[PDB]
Design an enzyme around this catalytic site. Structure first.
Site, PDB file in Angstrom:
ATOM      1  CG  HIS B  41      -0.792   0.102   2.485  1.00  0.00           C
ATOM      2  ND1 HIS B  41      -0.048   1.130   3.025  1.00  0.00           N
ATOM      3  CD2 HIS B  41      -1.214  -0.643   3.526  1.00  0.00           C
ATOM      4  CE1 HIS B  41      -0.008   1.000   4.353  1.00  0.00           C
ATOM      5  NE2 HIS B  41      -0.715  -0.071   4.680  1.00  0.00           N
ATOM      6  N   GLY B 143       2.495   5.699  10.954  1.00  0.00           N
ATOM      7  CA  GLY B 143       3.917   5.503  10.692  1.00  0.00           C
ATOM      8  C   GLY B 143       4.427   4.116  11.097  1.00  0.00           C
ATOM      9  CB  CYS B 145       2.283   0.590   7.853  1.00  0.00           C
ATOM     10  SG  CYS B 145       0.560   1.059   8.161  1.00  0.00           S
TER      11      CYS B 145
END
Ligand SMILES: c1ccc(-n2cnnn2)cc1
Ligand SMILES: [Cl-]
Ligand SMILES: [Cl-]
Lengths: 301, 301
Positions: B41, B143, B145
């Site tokens: 993503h 932040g 991920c």
């Protein structure tokens, strides 16, 4: 979101752990630059457990009496001295993985990470608090002596605890890195017991602020209290006195949530009287006292 | 003695974390051998996330669209591909800190350590269980991920988790390191919810063994029971069925304490029906289900 007991990343401390042997006794040591720090009780034998004269036992030792080992490497000791209850072995190599670091003594209420270790090898990492009675509630088995507690703020490791012993009630006692014990304890096997423990009130309040930040409001109420009336109530449940210092320290969390410190105290008074009635706060059915105001801001948005 | 929730020492993983940027998105990546792994993503704008076509968004990208930073050092990307929901960025340099590792997929009920990270920098470490409904109860902010989950067996790191998203109830969802989701979730901005969760029965029983070993014993009793009778009480209380395989895994602990599983089930039955009759067990007013049998044996012996 979410809220969890969270330890510091342990890598920088891991590269510092070694195994120290003297006589038939093995425990952990902490290798920084050209010094290994370990508990001085490593030099005791069977009948040195009650009334050891450490100055007399140390003078009788040579450097080659101490076997230090970092993984497979055998380090070589070239000097020894004592500072309070900590032993300092000087070695012929400086540790290439030594981080930026410092020694700091903490006060009751403060939190830190423990790296549990056996035979010089790390086993796991968890959070503890220094209790008001100067003990910690840890997880230590035989061979864990010399394990350390630490914080890491901004790439610098602050060492605050070295493990020496377990007391009869199942709780733990140790020193700072200058070898001074927390609390009235001594490194002798004479009978000793911790004082009755109390709950860390300022920390419980910080955790209620965390719950509100994470979207829980059920426990608030329309009341407030004076600081004095709060303390008279809370002491009847073995809570520590809240001071003006503690009130000041909660100022930022107050401002972020818009709930004044003494209003939140009223909520705490009510929880103490009523319990939780089937509900939970941040996944707990008790009031939690091992998160500081600083821990709350660090973890929350 | 003592019993604490304990993560694995995180240093072997700390050495693998980097920052990855594509346009205005930054998040975390895992650098092993000469590849960097991160959520696919990272290539999506806000608008793309509503309904993304990754096939098409990706062919339109090139190597120089991705900035990869390890500390203060730029890594050069020389290739790029997708495997399921994970992006693989080939780089010009092998990680000199790559540990012995493999990729593994875990089962519901099993535990692992999470190293929470921000801008490529490790921030904290904690233990989680993979819930029966395939979420975890973490603590994560924007932040985070690309943060990973893992176990250590001897010297080998088994990587099992990569963080992708937060669901409306505050719980967390992610993939294995081959990019397959745990649970019925998709990597797009759309309406998704966690299934009703259930309690992990075999883990609750493990934790009752730990309590007994540490001198908590009040909940024990003279009785025993059957798999069938118990399972019908469990079904009522949203507990997972207990199987003959679970009973066998708990074998070492049944031996050690002298309490048989179906004896402990009787204790647990009463606790579900009656309650804890006030008290706590190992400092909890809840029945804790995030410790496995192995976790208990590991910690206590
Ligand atoms: C007295 C106190 C503590 C110890 N131990 C520390 N680690 N293992 N044992 C030994 C004697
Ligand atoms: Cl302090
Ligand atoms: Cl009550």
């Amino acid at each position: 979101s979410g809220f969890r007991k969270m330890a510091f990343p342990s890598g920088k401390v891991e590269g510092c752990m070694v195994q120290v042997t003297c006589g038939t006794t093995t425990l952990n040591g902490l290798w920084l630059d050209d010094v290994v720090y370990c508990p001085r009780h490593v030099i005791c034998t069977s009948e040195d457990m009650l009334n050891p004269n450490y100055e007399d036992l140390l003078i009788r030792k040579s450097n080659h009496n101490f076997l230090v080992q970092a993984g497979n490497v055998q380090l070589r000791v070239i000097g020894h001295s004592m500072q309070n209850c900590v032993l300092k072995l000087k070695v012929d190599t400086a540790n290439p993985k030594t981080p930026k670091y410092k020694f700091v003594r903490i006060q009751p209420g403060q939190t830190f990470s423990v790296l549990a270790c056996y035979n010089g090898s790390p086993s796991g990492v968890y959070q503890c608090a220094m209790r008001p009675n100067f003990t910690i509630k840890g997880s230590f088995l035989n061979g864990s002596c010399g394990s350390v507690g630490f914080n890491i703020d901004y790439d610098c490791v602050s060492f605050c605890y070295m493990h020496h012993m377990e007391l009869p009630t199942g709780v733990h006692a140790g020193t700072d890195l200058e070898g001074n014990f927390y609390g009235p304890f001594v490194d002798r096997q004479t009978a000793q017991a911790a004082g009755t423990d109390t709950t860390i009130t300022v920390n419980v309040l910080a955790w209620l602020y965390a719950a509100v930040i994470n979207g829980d409001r059920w426990f608030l109420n329309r009341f407030t209290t004076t600081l004095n009336d709060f303390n008279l109530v809370a002491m009847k449940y073995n809570y520590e006195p809240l001071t003006q210092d503690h009130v000041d320290i909660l100022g930022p969390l107050s401002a972020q949530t818009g709930i004044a410190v003494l209003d939140m105290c009223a909520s705490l008074k009510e929880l103490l009287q009523n319990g939780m009635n089937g509900r939970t706060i941040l996944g707990s059915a008790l009031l939690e006292d091992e998160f500081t105001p600083f821990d709350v801001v660090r973890q929350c948005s």
